[PDB]
Design a protein around this ligand. Structure first.
Ligand SMILES: CCCCCCCCCCCC[N+](C)(C)[O-]
Ligand SMILES: CCCCCCCCCCCC[N+](C)(C)[O-]
Length: 421
């Protein structure tokens, strides 16, 4: 959904994150659950990373003539994890975790007609979480948590074929016969395909809490309600356009030129809040199944507006996403004291309504198809590894004067090691 990242755990990548939040064992998925802590005897530490290899493609042709084919844009993705849940007494316990539930790819050559809206896009996001939980009565446990999110981000864009058309158009209207437009055309042609049209980049922290509730029918059965707050990140970074300050103030699309000089610019990224009901059931000694349904009020992510020292708009862009559900169902098979198995189906609607899709964040309802294993070493430590396959229906896009077409597809590799004390 949009650009949030579930990943966070190999142990869970195996079950297409289906009910993460009611299936505590191996720790890790304590974060995103909080109220799971209460379910731990010995400090359990698990870590690892989930490798993401996405194949997203853009296809099309531009008024210009040049092709909009962008064969590959979403670079691989690292995204590590690391958790540490630790009991305190028999009513309390605390936990920590280093995850990254937000961020994206998107390359696009520094050339490419349509670069006007393709340049580059990066958002790395490390969410530091420290949670604690009470266990009220024998079957109810409540969790609360503070989160410290950090994020680096870069946004580059360049004048695509634009220069052409502009120039072109000029040259076919009673203005191509004008000593004026003529040179104007010239200048227009001068904007090299690869001229950095927009640059914004910045590092900044942001905070926000989170809570969760855990109810267990009995030891083998559970259900949960979780909530992660929004996280307004008030960036204070840099901006700059290599276009000549002339283009500015003509109320045209083209983002505020700075004559290739850096202006200090502010902007706010709203990482969305999210709710999630979940359930776990150990039907039979070896077999257990898990539900899951999540809400990510993406509605909060309305725009990427970037302002200046003097409070003017430097670079804006409508996003107007809308709420989205994500459903998941997976099961686990505990063969014997050493091995453990899992498999999952997961689906979720794209937060971005067609009216606003963008080659920048080509998003489309994603379908998950995963399964993995867990080789226990000795009642104390183990290793988690699972693969995931997400394929989605290629959808149409309409940005600027360009008509695109984008196809999504991607694989996942997970590996985790976890020890106990
Ligand atoms: C802290 C690690 C950050 C790794 C950056 C992760 C990039 C994942 C790529 C997501 C881009 C895909 N798409 C279609 C959703 O925009
Ligand atoms: C001053 C740096 C500002 C960049 C931080 C904003 C990153 C937004 C990344 C996700 C949305 C990207 N997009 C399509 C709106 O350009």
């Amino acid at each position: 959904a949009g650009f949030q990242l579930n990943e966070f755990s190999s142990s869970g990548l195996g079950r297409a994150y289906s009910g993460e939040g009611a299936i505590a064992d191996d720790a890790g998925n304590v974060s995103r659950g909080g109220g799971l802590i209460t379910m731990f005897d010995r400090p359990t530490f698990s870590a690892g990373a989930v490798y993401i290899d996405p194949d997203v493609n853009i296809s099309g042709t531009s008024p210009s003539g040049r092709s909009l084919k962008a064969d590959n844009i979403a670079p691989t993705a690292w995204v590590p994890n690391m958790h540490f849940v630790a009991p305190i007494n028999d009513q309390f316990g605390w936990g920590a975790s280093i995850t990254s539930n937000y961020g994206l790819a998107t390359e696009f050559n520094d050339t490419y007609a349509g670069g006007s809206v393709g340049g580059t896009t990066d958002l790395e996001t490390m969410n530091l979480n420290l949670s604690g939980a009470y266990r009220l009565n024998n079957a109810w446990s409540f969790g609360l948590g503070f989160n410290a999110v950090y994020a680096r981000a870069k946004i580059e864009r360049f004048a695509g074929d634009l220069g052409q058309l502009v120039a072109g158009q000029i040259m076919q209207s009673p203005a191509g016969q004008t000593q004026q437009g003529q040179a104007l055309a010239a200048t227009a042609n001068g904007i090299d395909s690869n001229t950095k049209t927009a640059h914004l980049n910045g590092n900044q922290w942001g905070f926000g809490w989170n809570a969760g509730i855990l109810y267990e029918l009995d030891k083998n059965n559970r259900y949960a309600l979780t909530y992660r707050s929004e996280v307004k990140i008030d960036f204070k970074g840099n901006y700059s356009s290599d276009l000549n300050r002339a283009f500015n103030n003509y109320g045209l699309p083209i983002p505020t030129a700075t004559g290739g000089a850096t202006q200090s610019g502010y902007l706010t990224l709203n990482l969305p809040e999210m709710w999630e009901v979940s359930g776990y059931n150990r039907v039979d000694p070896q077999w257990a199944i898990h539900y899951s349904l999540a809400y990510t009020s993406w509605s909060q992510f309305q725009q990427l507006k970037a302002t200046s020292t003097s409070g003017d708009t430097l670079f804006q862009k409508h996003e107007g996403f809308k709420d989205a559900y994500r459903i998941a169902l997976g099961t686990t098979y505990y063969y014997d004291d050493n091995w453990t198995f899992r498999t999952g189906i997961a689906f979720d609607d794209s937060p971005v309504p067609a009216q606003n899709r963008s080659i920048s964040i080509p998003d489309q309802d994603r379908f998950w198809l995963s399964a993995g294993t867990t080789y226990a070493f000795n009642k104390d430590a183990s290793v988690d590894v699972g693969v995931s396959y997400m394929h989605g229906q290629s959808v149409k896009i309409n940005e600027g004067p360009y008509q695109f077409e984008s196809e999504g597809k991607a694989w996942l590799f997970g590996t985790n090691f976890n020890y106990a004390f």
